[PDB]
Structure 1
Amino acid sequence: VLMKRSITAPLAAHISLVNKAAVDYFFVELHLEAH
């Protein structure tokens, strides 16, 4: 099969870290949990 299944893994690997860091960017800096 000719599809990306070994190049897309280091791409989703970055997408996930980005989204985790933004959800963390809310809580431990802007205190959405205190709201």
Structure 2
Amino acid sequence: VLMKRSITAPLAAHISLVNKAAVDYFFVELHLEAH
């Protein structure tokens, strides 16, 4: 079979972790929710 989707599944699993670690870093430290 031709697909590169068996490569994408361990990467999209990491993109979300990166984004959530960024938004928590905003919230509990730089107080955007307080702003």
TM-score range, shorter chain: 0.7 to 0.9
Overall identity of the aligned pairs, in %: 100
Identify the residue that residue 33 of structure 1 maps to in structure 2.
Answer: 33
Over aligned residues, Cα RMSD in angstroms?
A: 1.0
The Cα of 1:16 is off from its aligned counterpart by 0.8
Q: Which runs of 5+ in 1 are unaligned?
A: none
The number of aligned residues is 35
The Cα of 1:23 is off from its aligned counterpart by 1.0
> Could you list the runs of 4 or more consecutive aligned residues of structure 1 that deviate by over 2 angstroms after TM superposition?
none
Deviation digits for residues 1-35 of structure 1 (CA, Å, limit 9, x no counterpart)? 41112210001111110011111110011111111
Give the TM-score, by structure 1 length: 0.78
Q: In proportion to residue count, which structure has more helix?
A: 2
